[PDB]
Amino acid sequence: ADGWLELESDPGLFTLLLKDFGCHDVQVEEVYDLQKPIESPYGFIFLFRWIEIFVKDEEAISSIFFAQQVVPNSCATHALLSVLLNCNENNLQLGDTLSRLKTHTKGMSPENKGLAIGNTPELACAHNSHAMPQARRRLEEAFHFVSFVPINGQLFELDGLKPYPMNHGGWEDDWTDKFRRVMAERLQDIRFNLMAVVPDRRIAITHKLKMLRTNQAIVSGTLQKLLKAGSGSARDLQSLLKNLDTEIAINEQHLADENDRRHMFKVDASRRTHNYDKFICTFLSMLAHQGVLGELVSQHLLPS
């Protein structure tokens, strides 16, 4: 119950937070359209605001990572962890600290898991590093988070402020469709945000570019060797090479877009956690000292 600092709700903020947890193959992105396809999502985080089938077995709720929010302002971290620590080995590598936290809390009660979360110095440090100066000095209504994640052929709704994990999941045909149904049941608006936990897009794009480039190199080598040698036709090799070049161009543009988006994340984080006090003070002092503060102030008086 010590208390952490308060964070803003931003997909870039959460992406950089998870990167600061040592988990480097994960990225958070906002879901504007629910029906738009999302590829390989690890889970979803649902934030609600300004508004008015339980697993109750004591062995079942302990056999899965359902943590209870003990630290007050740790909601974003809690939801992100409820999503990530309910993923397995195949797709992502959790950080060293996150893997240690996962093994440490194997059969613990929800309370004990929440306490383990709250008493991990790495997590608290990384979470409070993303706080604005306003939150720091305020320490002296926000959002409520709910996680959605598939475990074993069943979709789970984890709420750190509720006694039991909500299991209401089954599908046959893909869990994204079941989650879309469940969300369309309960549901633009400013009282709701929806974010998807997805693999790092930059990584997938770079790998696709590597594959495209090596295939293009193979076909260009064979083609140039053939033409040098000087019989058979070479139409199909040229067609293959043309389509490979087109795909490489498309994916290079994708990589550039993702790179500038990551840079925008970085700059928004660097500004969000900056204390502009000394800058404003010295700026106003230099304006006064230069003799031009008076004119400017006379031009921008607040209307009354």
């Binding site: 500004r271 900056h274 230099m286 006064a288 503060l293 008076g294």
Partner: protein, 96 residues
């Protein structure tokens, strides 16, 4: 020169977000601009790394605008008077 720390300052009645911007920064001498950039966020300071020109979105922000607005409000609340500054230094002594 002019009141910068008391609720009776004219700044407490001034739209600071419009006062402090790229043109107003350009009004300053180069040495002043360098010493001032040394107080920006590291990304914008790095972007500006002999008049210095700032990023078009260095001061025109979402965070710097709120910084200006909250700075004016804190000035009105009296957070910047030397008595409150010494009181916060006594509190900092109590913390350390």
């Amino acid at each position: 020169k002019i009141d910068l720390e008391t609720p009776d300052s004219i700044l407490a009645s001034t739209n600071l977000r419009a006062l402090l911007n790229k043109q107003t920064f350009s009004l300053l001498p180069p040495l002043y601009q360098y010493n001032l950039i040394q107080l920006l966020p590291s990304v914008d300071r790095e972007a500006s790394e002999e008049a210095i020109r700032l990023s078009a979105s260095c001061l025109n922000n979402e965070f710097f605008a709120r910084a200006c607005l909250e700075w004016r409000e804190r000035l009105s609340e009296g957070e910047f008077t030397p008595e409150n500054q010494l009181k916060l230094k006594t509190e900092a002594e109590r913390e350390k």
